[PDB]
Curated annotation (Swiss-Prot), chains A, B, C:
One of its GO terms (cellular component) is cytoplasm. Belongs to the peptidase M18 family. Pfam families: Peptidase_M18. The gene is apeB. Gene3D superfamilies: Aminopeptidase i, Domain 2 (2.30.250.10), Zn peptidases (3.40.630.10). One of its GO terms (molecular function) is zinc ion binding. Zn(2+) binds at residues 64, 354. Its cofactor is Zn(2+). Keywords: Aminopeptidase, Hydrolase, Metal-binding, Metalloprotease, Protease, Zinc. GO terms for biological process: proteolysis. This is Probable M18 family aminopeptidase 2. It comes from Pseudomonas aeruginosa (strain ATCC 15692 / DSM 22644 / CIP 104116 / JCM 14847 / LMG 12228 / 1C / PRS 101 / PAO1). Its EC number is 3.4.11.-.
Length: 379, 379, 379
């Protein structure tokens, strides 16, 4: 395919090391008939572009910024066996590795003067494991805290480091790289990261004609709450009349899209899907659930994002769950459907989620830039 | 730590016997550049005080009125073994005692004329236990219903008692008393009760300059729903412009604070916390969770309510959970963050929660009255 | 610390990607009163240096080349779900990750003409995992096979790749890197790798006077058998008289040393050692077991390699097991004691073994180059 737009989220992920570092790298490119953006919490971004003219509706689309990682506790000074450690919260999903990896502290730090500022880069932390203690319920708090320093007793300029810590996380460095024998997969983080990037690489590439909204946020991998689930109001509809006939008429003429991450049949875990699947290196699968998870995506939603894909060349896929299996996955738009908009719940074929690497096709992004760019047009 | 402001929630809790009896004892003191209050359901109170002037924001703060207790069923006439009993619902948290205690019926009663009126006071009920049936899953419905009357067959003026059981609860009488050898703890109910009183003893004590909101409610110890989780709108913002630019600009210039209850290391259950804790007789600990409970409290929230505590003399503490442990605790503001305000989730060092007595320092209230009173000023 | 000799095994490990690629990187540096070396299987190296003169004895020392990794099967073509896979054998130890990582195929390929030749480099493989299938005995064959190619049906110059699968393994690419906040640890592979390198960087650095032997091999992480456990005979003693008085007299005047890997107290797994431990950034710990593992190292062995460490500046440590715990660890010399030589079983403080990264101090190598270099001169 093309290794030019694939070489865009790679340096992005390095700069978008976290949710707010993603936010920082988000607006640094996303700038230059309006084209304004709102930052609010410095983690939830909404990019509005004018060409709503009331009876034209909106073209909403969005994905979260945060990803399951290790959040450093308030002041977690753990000095054991001559090793300095920083206790961590199990933010988001679980899984093993975390264990091993480069590891680096990142995020905002409010200094002594009521002032917030962020900093990152350089390998400083690690999570060691047991081995010879033979065959290995495991993992309970006192296993995940990483090692930073190693000495005793004591015999961006940035203040050394000290104790003014946090809302701070830990991410593995080793920059994103292309994998497989040819070019059939890559990626490290990209847990709706890059989805909060390729969508941004679309709001400046799509043909200018109608109103388009790029809504990135935080907390989806937890609850969504403040930022990802209310209030989307006023942040989007700030134009022409407060809340009388400004909403309803416009939002019912609108169409929201979510850029999530579908799994697709695992070559080793083949008995985790059925019939309709979604292997890597393919277009965005239309995810349809109503049972005990209930995403959005209805009749006139799947059809309006399958023909829209076919017109600008496919392949569009479907499904992610099982009749017996399937859990939660309240991915952004569905809790954001409380606005009053029909939501297209799609994504990209990607397994080994909620971790710090492994499996995600190097072709799906070429289909995600198109179609969604074509979505940014026509009525 | 003066024995004068501590002798204020003691008679308060006696009058604030329930959620609506707290509401009644709330507005009776909370009265006399506005200073109005809304009651709505007669259980959810919002005290607004004017000095928002748009670009000044709000100074929101609140805590729920209700507490885990035994609510009497609709018409639960249980006559067994010559004893008259009233079946009860397991409202809120669980625990044993409830068992024993004085016990008294309370709440608002809707009489025959579409009219509601409340009444309480005097010991009438009790919950007896088994003993000689040897070593003692226990507790399942038929164990909690208390005994009121004891006879057969039949051989505020207030109608005798009869059958019109309101929405009626049961609380232990024995009024709040000071404990420990000196004055190092006390308290009975105070499950965010007193927090809906000390905050009220702050809205009339804080220096008059800016707009301040005291928001008490019900159902947090259940789900929050109607009263504690939407709509906070119009109840707070009823002034200057409907919902166009009245919100957003003002609420982003605002700062919400929650007055909860932190645990702090138990001298017997030491392995329920880590590093950062919060023993009794101390200032409000900054509770920080994002993992699988996700309260509010961010970077510029913890720092804005730690320096504000230090300026008016500390000690401010932190944390309440473990990396492996920790469950729910959707305490008020966090579900109320759906308004769109940054929330400080603090509280008071107190264990033996969700019951009818035991452990809560007699010094923490002297720090909670200050700091939060100092929060009611400056920008 | 010293970051010059530490920047030597880093490019070494990149070239010493396998056991025989270690062998290749071994002799390429280890060349230029004899100084000959034997290769035999192209995996077991013995470096002899003359200055035995019968009554002078030998100064034997050694460590294995191989490390627990995923060896590709004979012809394991697994085409599932449009993905091409290569089935792997669980060579050596177990553990998770392997899972994820860069992954690359390597080893000596025997081409069509009775001719063996090795090749490596570049990321081609990956091992993906399950996530949303909820809480995660796990791992049994059909989970470890990595993904190489991804397409169907078909619509050093080196032969493409085809089907002639050698004796071929898979290792993670991401080159060795320095870790911690300062310089308090690093390392990726180094599972007695680098021990088959720092010892090589000693046979050319030690003062020339007596006979010194550097004996590296394969299979210790399996059984030892051919290469690591007999016959060491004739490979070492090839000089002056066959096997009458050439051995016995010389080997009893000799002293063998093993360069293994000690654990040292884990900051999270503190209850896996007792009293005598060995934290990272320290000299070689004298490992002493006789119970149900029985390594070598006796009275005049521990004392002869503790005073020899103290004379050339310490710190020398001790122990690795527990009275109740401890398993196998038949590390090289002990099965090589069948020659008839007293063996010093030492190593380097390093946990998170038998995997492809994590923990190993960046100071221990500066102590391992010394002492053992001072051992190369004993009178």
């Amino acid at each position: 395919l093309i290794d030019f737009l694939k070489a865009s989220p790679t340096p992005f992920h390095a700069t978008a090391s976290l949710a707010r570092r993603l936010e920082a790298a988000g607006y640094r490119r996303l700038d230059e008939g309006g084209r304004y953006y709102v930052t609010r919490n410095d983690s939830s971004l909404i990019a509005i572009r004018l060409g709503s003219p009331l009876e034209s509706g909106f073209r909403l689309v969005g994905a979260h910024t945060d990803s399951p990682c290790l959040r450093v506790k308030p002041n977690p000074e753990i000095a054991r066996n001559g090793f300095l450690q920083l206790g961590v919260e199990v933010y988001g999903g679980a899984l093993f590795a975390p264990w091993f990896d480069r590891d680096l502290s990142l995020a905002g730090r409010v200094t002594f003067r009521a002032n917030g500022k962020l900093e990152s880069r350089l390998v400083d932390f690690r999570k060691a494991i047991a081995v010879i203690p033979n065959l290995n319920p495991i993992n309970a708090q006192n296993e995940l805290p990483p090692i930073i320093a190693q000495l005793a007793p004591g015999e961006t300029a940035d203040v050394v480091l000290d104790y003014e810590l946090s809302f701070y996380d830990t991410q593995s460095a080793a920059v994103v790289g292309l994998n497989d024998e040819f070019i059939a997969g890559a990626r490290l983080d990209n847990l709706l990261s890059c989805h909060a990037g390729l969508e941004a690489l679309l709001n400046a590439e799509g043909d200018e004609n109608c109103i388009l909204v790029c809504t990135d946020h935080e907390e989806v991998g937890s609850c969504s709450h403040c930022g990802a689930d209310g209030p989307f109001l006023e942040q989007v509809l700030r134009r022409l009349l407060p809340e009388g006939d400004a909403f309803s008429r416009a939002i019912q003429r609108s169409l929201l899209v979510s850029a999530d991450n579908a799994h697709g049949v695992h070559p080793n875990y083949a008995d985790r899907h059925d019939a309709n699947h979604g292997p890597a290196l393919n277009g965005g699968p239309v995810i349809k659930i109503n049972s005990n998870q209930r995403y959005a995506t209805n009749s006139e939603t799947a059809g309006f994002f399958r023909h829209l894909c076919q017109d600008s060349e496919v392949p569009v896929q479907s499904f992610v769950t099982r009749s017996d299996m399937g859990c939660g996955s309240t991915i952004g738009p569905i809790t954001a459907s409380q606005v009053g908009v029909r939501t297209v719940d799609i994504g990209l074929p990607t397994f080994a989620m909620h971790s710090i690497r492994e499996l995600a096709g190097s072709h799906d992004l070429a289909h995600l830039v198109k179609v969604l760019g074509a979505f940014y047009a026509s009525s």
